[PDB]
């Protein structure tokens, strides 16, 4: 069903019912990296969180980038916006990353143990009454509860849609950031600047006219 290549044999470790029950299953594994089932389950958790950080990241690059080229903001380019906003600030970057890795590390190490055993953090006496809402759902990577304020989870149909819409906007955003890094090395301009350069001259201004598709 709906493979990435319509003629390929889909590898058999994406056609098991514990793998066809998964968002974004287009039969794409040409290295066989997820043949082991827990390695598939671990890499499925890596893809959800590489994509959600990328969707939050890319919307932190082009949404203040498109709303800067259209006026009403003064946010600079994303490859220079780390240099600024530390002088409109209070700590050194060392004094800021260490508090970051404390705050992020308490979260990630709780998600670590919930992957190892689902419903880990739902055991009583963990938190100060807040640990009840942290059992996740029956499938991991989708916690809900306090992570679903609008309450879109409790459908059981339209639900595989919101899964597959998250992954496809997520996989597009991961290619967008791998875009953004590559279209900053190769030309040094902005990503909206590269979009403006491609729209004013598509047939001469592209990656065929720089030194990185070199023969």
């Amino acid at each position: 069903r709906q493979s990435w290549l319509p003629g390929s044999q889909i590898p058999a470790h994406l056609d098991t019912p514990a793998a066809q029950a998964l968002a974004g299953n287009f039969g794409f594994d040409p290295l066989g990296l997820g043949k082991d089932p827990v390695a598939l389950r671990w890499y499925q958790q890596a893809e959800l969180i590489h994509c959600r950080t990328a969707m939050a990241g890319v919307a932190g690059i082009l949404i203040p980038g498109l709303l800067t080229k259209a006026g009403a903001l003064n946010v600079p380019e994303w490859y220079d916006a780390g240099k600024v906003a530390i002088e409109n600030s209070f700590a050194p970057w060392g004094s800021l990353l260490a508090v970051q890795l404390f705050l992020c590390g308490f979260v990630e190490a709780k998600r670590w143990q919930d992957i190892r055993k689902p419903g880990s953090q739902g055991e009583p006496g963990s938190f100060l009454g807040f640990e009840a809402s942290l059992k996740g759902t029956s499938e991991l990577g989708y916690p809900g509860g306090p992570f679903d304020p609008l309450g879109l989870s409790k459908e059981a149909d339209k639900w595989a849609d919101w899964k597959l819409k998250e992954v496809k906007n997520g996989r597009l955003a991961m290619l967008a950031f791998l875009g953004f890094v590559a279209q900053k090395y190769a030309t040094g301009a902005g990503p909206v600047d590269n979009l403006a350069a491609h729209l004013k001259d598509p047939w001469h201004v592209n990656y065929a006219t720089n030194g990185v598709s070199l023969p």
Binding site: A72, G129, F130, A132, S133, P146, D148
Partner: protein
Amino acid sequence: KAGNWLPGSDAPAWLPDDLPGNYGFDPLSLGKEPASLKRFTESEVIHGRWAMLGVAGSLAVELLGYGNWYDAPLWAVNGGKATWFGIEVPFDLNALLAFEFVAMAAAEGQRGDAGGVVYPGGAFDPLGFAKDSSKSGELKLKEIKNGRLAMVAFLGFVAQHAATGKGPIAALGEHLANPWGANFATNGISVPFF
């Protein structure tokens, strides 16, 4: 019950209708376990009672003209000679902070880790209104409702001071001096665009 907070919505089954301040408002299912809900009914009242004391102290400073709530700890830095009703009190910061660490934990440890009760029957009711016969859940409802208003209003003090830098009455006089030009949109903080 007495309310629905969004009319037409079902009520959560894990919120009993007997409880004071109930509306069925838990869209997160955040109190589905009974021990978590029992801790939360203890903690909402105590957050509500301290905020009612908090929001009254923030208003009565500006009602009596002693600066505002933000500037009352501006003697520990940039000077000294703390005031209360205009009367001097010759305490520095590092002494009363130690006084309010020992004496408050002495009142916390009698309250918190000596049970879980939040309406203690006895010495905390001097005049005597709620004898738990009939008028209890009515007045407990009012303690929640005035308490929930206070927690909103204190959160409406911190966000108002983070945006405009002015106190409660100092900008309520401005919203009354300019109804359409002294609200949360004329500053370029709460609405970033227009």
